[PDB]
Amino acid sequence: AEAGITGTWYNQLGSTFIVTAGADGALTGTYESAVGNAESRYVLTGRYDSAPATDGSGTALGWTVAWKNNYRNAHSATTWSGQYVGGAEARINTQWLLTSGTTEANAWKSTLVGHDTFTKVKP
Amino acid sequence: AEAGITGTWYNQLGSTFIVTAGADGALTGTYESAVGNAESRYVLTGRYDSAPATDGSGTALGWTVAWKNNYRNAHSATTWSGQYVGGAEARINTQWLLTSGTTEANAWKSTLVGHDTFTKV
């Protein structure tokens, strides 16, 4: 449900995700790196599947962050795909892909994969 | 077809893979990298699922290569998961995971993912 998703979330590496879920399935916000001052904020956009999910099923969602802002340009973008699971302890469990822009020759090793779990802290 | 997996396969990057499929699910061979070279050969071991597949399905398999031989040690290993499809043009379509040994702080980016299609051409 949009409300449950909306809020501030953190993951085990110390990064910050601030998101607002709109009624039209949109996801917007900012993502901040693990500690490190104020200018570590990047724009994120995503989508969530507003489910009739009376199954205790999670809500599927995903979002993208291109690692470029006014202070830095890492020439890479990450996409997180996962599910939002509500309750008193809501969590968003994801798997992510981080692709860096490479030349033809290193394209083979341009993508990293991992997983992150986010815990909600504020609305 | 069943032991049609046995043979020499090549992928788009130039690497060669030579394997023997045992009648009970084993996959053994050598994987050689860039240039062909001489000891760009690494041991590979894997498993494949021997099944009836009336519905024209491919054969699931996977294998690993630790990137260490008596000449190099890249502190990493790759696992390929995919399926074999035989026919006039047999192919092995895979997705792979390459994990490097890192320290905690770099563990978040220890794994690369990709895909490779191997042919006998």
């Binding site: - | 990298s33 890249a74 390459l98």
Partner: peptide, 8 residues
Amino acid sequence: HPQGPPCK
């Protein structure tokens, strides 16, 4: 890395 192409 021995998994990539050659370094030619």
